């Protein structure tokens, strides 16, 4: 009953933020199981074509997810690539992931979700998604989401020129074949290629690879980016994973962009959200959502 699920998720459009949508347990379990098989049938390194809308972190800010679709166009009017970190911190992670999974099932060739570092049980145990599942449903449903997260794809290349992933580059990343050989389902390890793709950050003050203040993975400098793009015949890295005041922010003379789609992020920041449009000529533009 996929249309009924989407209809009830969208009903709270225009409402005051916070109003819950409580689907049944069996509906939610259905969403995980069907989306999981779609994720596994599709490559772990997606090959996408413009036109596309690209969105960064959401973190359970469900009313801002609805805002994004209002600006970008509700599926299937636009094609979407999300870069991860759907859950934790916000008050409505369940509504957020459920609508994203519902859209992946309904439009499986035009709607895409990458894995962020919060799509990992050990992380979202700490940062709120476990608690939200336990309170509103039960722990077994959280384990069902985990099994589904473990199958998400990790990266995307749009029209052979834009490399997308949640976190960033890896010192272990020599060829795109290494990403394609990552076996799913898997948990995110504490180090290595999959970790770095989900966890690394650019840094304006590092030359080469540096220690990451997060305590996980690395920072990389502008020269790492330029070498990567030249080596792989790419034009742009598109990533998320860090809040930026204007919703998007360029790095390395516009060779990398950070996208963040949760305005007024977890109430603490006064940032805009942004969504990047890529048209058929690979021109990029940004739609801005102020707090
Ligand atoms: Mn995040
Ligand atoms: Mn992140």
Domain ranges for the chain: 2-12+23-289
Residue 116 to residue 166: CA distance in whole angstroms: 5
**CA 121 to ligand 1 centroid distance, Å:** 14
Strand partners, 45: 155
Structure-determination technique: X-ray
Residue 7 to residue 26: CA distance in whole angstroms: 17
Residue 287 to residue 56: CA distance in whole angstroms: 12
User: What is the 8-class DSSP label of residue 190?
Assistant: S
Residue 130 to residue 122: CA distance in whole angstroms: 9
Q: Which of 78, 28, 76 is nearest to 55 (CA)?
A: 78
Q: Coil, strand or helix: which one is 16?
A: coil
Cite the active site residues: 118
238 token code pair: 């598109």
- We find that the CATH architecture of domain 2-12+23-289 is 4-Layer Sandwich (3.60)
**CA 1 to ligand 1 centroid distance, Å:** 31
Do 122 and 161 touch, CB atoms closer than 8 A? Answer: no
- Name the phi and psi angles at 178, rounded to 5: -65, -35
| H/E element, 142 | helix 139-149
Q: 252-257 long-range contacts, Cβ below 8 Å, gap at least 24? A: 252/202, 252/222, 252/225, 252/226, 253/222, 255/222, 255/225, 255/226, 255/229, 256/168, 256/202, 256/225, 257/284
**CA 135 to ligand 2 centroid distance, Å:** 24
Tokens 């709607």 belong to 111
Q: Which of 117, 108, 96, 122 is nearest to 35 (CA)?
A: 108
Tokens 């997606």 belong to 46
Exposure of 145 in the CB half-sphere (CA atoms within 13 A): 32
- Determine whether the annotation assigns residue 232 to a binding site: no
Angle of helix 93-106 relative to helix 2-10, nearest 10 degrees, comes to 140
Specify the length of the chain in residues.
Answer: 291
Cα distances from 250 to residues 62, 168, 204, 225, 239, in angstroms, run 26, 14, 11, 12, 10
- Determine whether the annotation assigns residue 85 to a binding site: yes
- Determine whether the annotation assigns residue 166 to a binding site: yes
């Amino acid at each position: 009953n996929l249309d009924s699920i989407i209809g009830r998720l969208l009903e709270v459009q225009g409402s005051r933020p916070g109003k819950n949508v409580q689907l049944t347990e069996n509906e939610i379990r259905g969403l995980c199981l069907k989306s999981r098989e779609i994720f596994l049938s599709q490559p772990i390194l997606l090959e996408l074509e413009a036109p596309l809308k690209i969105c960064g972190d959401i973190h359970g800010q469900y009313y801002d997810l609805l805002r994004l679709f209002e600006y970008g166009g509700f599926p299937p009017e636009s094609n979407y690539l999300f870069l991860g970190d759907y859950v934790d911190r916000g008050k409505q992670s369940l509504e957020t992931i459920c609508l994203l999974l519902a859209y992946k099932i309904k439009y499986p060739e035009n709607f895409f979700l990458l894995r962020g570092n919060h799509e990992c049980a050990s992380i979202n145990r700490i940062y709120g998604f476990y608690d939200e599942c336990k309170r509103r449903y039960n722990i077994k449903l959280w384990k069902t989401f985990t099994d589904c997260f473990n199958c998400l794809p990790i990266a995307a290349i749009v029209d052979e020129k834009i490399f997308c992933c949640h976190g960033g580059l890896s010192p272990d990343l020599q060829s795109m074949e290494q990403i394609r050989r990552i076996m799913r389902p898997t948990d995110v390890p504490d180090q290595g290629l999959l970790c770095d793709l989900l966890w690394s950050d650019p840094d304006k003050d590092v030359q080469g690879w540096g220690e990451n203040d997060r305590g996980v993975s690395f920072t990389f400098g502008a020269e790492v980016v330029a070498k990567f793009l030249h080596k792989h015949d790419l034009d742009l890295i598109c990533r998320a994973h860090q809040v930026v005041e204007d919703g998007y922010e360029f790095f390395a003379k516009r060779q990398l962009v950070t996208l963040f789609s949760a305005p007024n992020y977890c109430g603490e920041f006064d940032n805009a959200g942004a969504m990047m449009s890529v048209d058929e000529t690979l021109m990029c533009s940004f739609q801005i959502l102020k707090p």
